[PDB]
From a paper:
For the mixed chirality AMBP bp69, we obtained two crystal structures of lectin LecB complexed with bp71, an analog of the mixed chirality AMBP bp69 with an additional side-chain fucosylated lysine at the C-terminus. The six individual structures of the mixed chirality AMBP featured essentially the same double-stapled amphiphilic α-helix as that observed in the parent homochiral AMBP structures. Remarkably, the ten crystallographically non-equivalent stapled bicyclic α-helices observed in the X-ray structures of the homochiral rac-bp65 and bp70, and the mixed chirality bp71·LecB complex were essentially superimposable, with RMSD < 0.6 Å for the peptide backbones. In the case of bp65, bp71 and Fln65 the peptides were aggregated in bundles of four of more helices via hydrophobic contacts between leucine side chains. A closer analysis of the different X-ray structures showed that the peptides did not make any significant contact with LecB apart from the anchoring fucose residue. By investigating the structure of AMPBs we discovered the mixed chirality sequence bp69 containing seven l- and four d-residues folding into an amphiphilic α-helix within a stapled bicyclic peptide similar to the parent all l-AMBP bp65.
Author numbering:
A (entry chain B), C (entry chain A), D (entry chain D), E (entry chain C): 1 to 114
B (entry chain F), F (entry chain H), G (entry chain E): 103 to 114
The structure:
């Protein structure tokens, strides 16, 4: 199934934050309405924050996370979780190799903000 | 197996 | 029900990251085996990261997140989510007032690392 | 925080299923737009299905799960999870006593159907 | 990534329940320690329970859900959610056709019981 | 689990 | 945080 694609309410501010856990540099692209809205890049095996940003979901609300490593798309796992019918997390893990820890880039999207 | 080879191996 | 308490696998490194979305200064305490392991303090209405740290779950694996604003404990909501039986998120929202957005401090714990 | 309340898309059919794990008889009321749409009453200490029903979320999509035992409301925990941006689960646990297993009535809502 | 595989605590009783939303007959296999422990078969477009059973996670705690229709495995999506650090849901959806509703067999695993 | 907790338990 | 500070806090 498709992973890393989330439908947010339209025109909504959301946070996106990426962590790295891999020997390879992680490239995280965040697309809003099918256009690149943010790109994070960094290398860490110690969960360093390689990027954090506030974006807007725009007229469509469609948000997609893509992860690549040295130009190769990583395999993604994702889910959205809602607490007390209000607090939203869109969660992404990714695998760039064969050990299947799925933490090589970890991406957390959260809303509402403010 | 080289300098990069070593760092690679050590980090993994 | 108790919220903000998670049993991690013992002796496992995990990331803990806190975001703020409130006019109030957020004090986030992370306890491991009932002992204070990290404390973050910050204020933002734009999802700023007020703290991020790698900790060890220790011999008990018990991790507790507490949030307070000017000494008053915030109301917490929490859950743990596991993707592909490997990637773990322990999620905390908190409410310091009466609007019930539950984002005033948002805490994300993730493991495994590396 | 409020638990057991979920906003569904309007005019959408959803499944609701209750399991029991308690010496006490569980009464589960499922409210749609603030009015009871289904009621289940049963007792099991081994996860028997005490009710399952297809409901329609109606005009506003507000769904609320209430659990009582001997007329006393149980303490609820809940969350919603979305897989592949499409498949939705709304999850409720409840505690009627002192052991805090939170399984005394377990309620799972799922959509879409068909 | 692998879907439908969950590590439960060892030697733990759990419930497994399957619902069907498809014109195709669903066959759901539940494996514990890589051996079939339960099989459900049924057809419904109305979210009918096609099977419910109580199993033991055994020495390994490894539980796997497989879904197939007419010999053809469905595409699975899955996640595990833990509420109040105690109540566990392991959730599976599946797509047997082309419409990507991922509800054709829905499988809910819950623990603890009793 | 405290006085009320106990009372709750005994009454059951 | 003073007079006006407290009023804001109380009203908020
Ligand atoms: C240090 C390793 O780096 C990668 C593979 C090599 O390179 C990751 O896939 C592994 O999970 C691990 O973090
Ligand atoms: C700006 C506001 O700050 C608080 C109340 C005052 O202060 C928060 O509870 C609100 O959610 C909102 O973020
Ligand atoms: C059998 C017991 O029934 C209840 C209490 C009475 O007795 C539940 O709260 C317990 O969790 C347990 O299932
Ligand atoms: C009635 C249909 O049955 C299947 C296809 C045919 O067969 C499912 O994949 C669809 O989602 C839908 O429930
Ligand atoms: Ca990896
Ligand atoms: Ca890794
Ligand atoms: Ca608030
Ligand atoms: Ca807020
Ligand atoms: Ca109980
Ligand atoms: Ca019970
Ligand atoms: Ca389908
Ligand atoms: Ca279907």
């Amino acid at each position: 199934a498709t992973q890393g694609v989330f439908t947010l309410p339209a025109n909504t501010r959301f946070g996106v934050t990426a962590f790295a856990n891999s020997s390879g540099t992680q490239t995280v692209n965040v697309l809003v309405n099918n256009e690149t809205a943010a790109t994070f890049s960094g290398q860490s095996t110690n969960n360093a924050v390689i990027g954090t940003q506030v974006l807007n979901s725009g007229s469509s609300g469609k948000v997609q996370v893509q992860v690549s490593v040295n130009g190769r798309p990583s395999d993604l796992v994702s889910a959205q979780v809602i607490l007390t019918n209000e607090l939203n997390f869109a969660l992404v893990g990714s695998e760039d190799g064969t050990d299947n820890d799925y933490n090589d880039a970890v991406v957390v999207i959260n809303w509402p903000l403010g | 197996x080289x300098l990069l080879x070593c760092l690679x191996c050590l980090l993994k």
